[PDB]
Amino acid sequence: DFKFSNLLGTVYRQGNITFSDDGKQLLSPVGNRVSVFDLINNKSFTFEYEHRKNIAAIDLNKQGTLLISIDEDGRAILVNFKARNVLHHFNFKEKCSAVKFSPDGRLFALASGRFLQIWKTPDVNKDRQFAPFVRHRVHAGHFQDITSLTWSQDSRFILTTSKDLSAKIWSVDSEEKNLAATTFNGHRDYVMGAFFSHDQEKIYTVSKDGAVFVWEFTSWRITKKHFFYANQAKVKCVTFHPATRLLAVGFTSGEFRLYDLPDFTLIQQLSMGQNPVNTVSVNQTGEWLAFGSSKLGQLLVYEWQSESYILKQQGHFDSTNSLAYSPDGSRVVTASEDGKIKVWDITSGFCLATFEEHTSSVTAVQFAKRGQVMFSSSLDGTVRAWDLIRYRNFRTFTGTERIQFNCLAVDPSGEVVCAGSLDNFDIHVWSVQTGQLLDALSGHEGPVSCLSFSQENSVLASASWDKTIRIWSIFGRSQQVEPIEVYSDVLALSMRPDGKEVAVSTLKGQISIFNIEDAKQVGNIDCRKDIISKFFTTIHYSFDGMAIVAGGNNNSICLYDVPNEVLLKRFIVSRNEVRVTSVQFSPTANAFAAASTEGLLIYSTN
């Protein structure tokens, strides 16, 4: 069946980002889920699983098989990275700032408050554990919160940094030395990073005030001191890549910097925005610098030798009204209250374009199928045709007066486009080509609020405040000149593709189906499932007319069997008001897309 697969409009929220071990993919906490970006192919996806709250910390083990993520309350989900299934939950009972697997993947380490926890794979001797990792030791030493962790390449040692202005180094395999083996004093401000150098004979400590200390064995003594002298900015994050000797630093201003150690040579000095750099990652070759800022919330992948950006996105924050799939199913396009229209590439997850001609809320968008032509309707009140190959607005249809448009229907062929208004009881009709006004469809006696064509030429259903469905043919003879009486009110109407039936969603929790030849109700579904009086405001038939997908101002999205009038699957939108305003199958119904308050949601099957 269908599973959550993409979260569009959001690339980074909070927490740490991390490259895969080969340096080719980037993981990004995207709220309470984790996204993965394929940087060499421009694909991304989002994991199905959700945390109870926002993610605070993640790590992918070296062997590329185990993903662990931790929400703000210290509730951790461990995931089979390659099969995408959840393997386990941990409760660490405390806020964790950082988690990191040991290089050999046998261990992982936690920063929970002031403590360093070490977790291990169960010994076959103790022989009766049902968890992939048991806790092996808690290490108590710091006076305040551990800030970051760094493993020693041999996996036997770890560095912690803290707000207590020290770093410490722990022996974390040999049983049992529970106490830090060396403490590193003392910076003025919080120690942000502490790193072994590639040869393991130098340690670097970096601190919020802006200091780097070099430490060598002689006991460990400070050997040199360096300073960023960045003004009105503190170190907000830092990482180090030992083999290429690269230190990447992100500041509370938009600024980030690249150095090498131990020379402390300034290689790069740039900005990413005007907001804090919350997380930084250097990929395996050193060639690629990743940055996350929360406020906006940006994600950057930067190839610094060539001064070019591999990836550069921020979060989107529109209120979406309508969404429409392109016929190939490659893209979905969304309509926004501010009046913007956006084009999204399903496979990359990114926004290809942004039109802004509409000077008022875009109420609907719909594809002429084929080709790359998309129509939009607006309160402003115009209908606009859009070319998606050249990304422009060639035609613009209006009425002989300034009337808002609320709904939109594009004859699939598409000879003609039509739109309903609140400012009258007629359906307005334009020849696409001419592209002038045609004789309206006038018989409704309430404002028309829903429109829907079939695929099989060329039945037009409409729905009105008058609480009736009418059936039209723009040019030929209708298939039902008689009205249909719904008791009511109709929030959404989807015409079955064949054109022999129609479905509507009512103000009661009813999806009801009507035969058009008989103008009588053939099926009613009582929609009762809404993890929230209760209804649906958007429905859509699948291509073969066997399924309806539905959402409304609640937290459930429902997938109904239409013949058997049952529920196939319910999708709880969010696990922490939630609204879904537009819902639609992809052309081959291999997926469906939902415009929610939690962003653009894609559910898929494979």
Numbering used by the authors: 4 to 221, 247 to 560, 577 to 620, 678 to 707
Give passages from the manuscript.
In these yeast cells, around 50 AFs and several snoRNAs, such as U3, U14 and snR30, associate co-transcriptionally with the 35S pre-RNA to form the first pre-ribosomal particle known as 90S or the SSU-processome. The UTP-B complex consists of Utp6p, Utp12p/Dip2p, Utp13p, Utp18p, Utp21p, and Pwp2p/Utp1p5. Pwp2p is a protein subunit of UTP-B and essential for the stable assembly of a large set of proteins forming the SSU-processome. We report the structure of the N-terminal domain of Pwp2p, which exhibits a prototypical tandem WD40 repeat (tWD).
The WD-repeat-containing region of Pwp2p (residues 1–716) was subcloned, produced and purified as described in the Methods section. The purified protein was crystallized, and X-ray diffraction data were collected up to 2.54 Å resolution. Over the 716 residues of the construct, the final model comprises 608 residues (from residue 4 to 707). Pwp2p (1–716) contains two canonical WD40 domains, WD1 and WD2. Each WD domain is a seven-bladed β-propeller composed of four anti-parallel β-strands. The first WD-repeat domain (WD1) is composed of residues 12–343. The second WD-repeat domain (WD2) is composed of residues 4–11 and 344–706. The connection between the two WD domains is ensured by residues 12–14 and 342–346 in addition to the external β-strands of blade 1 of each WD domain, and the loop connecting blade 1 and blade 2. The two WD domains form an angle of approximately 30°. Several patches of conserved residues were identified, some of which were spanning an extended area over WD1 and WD2.
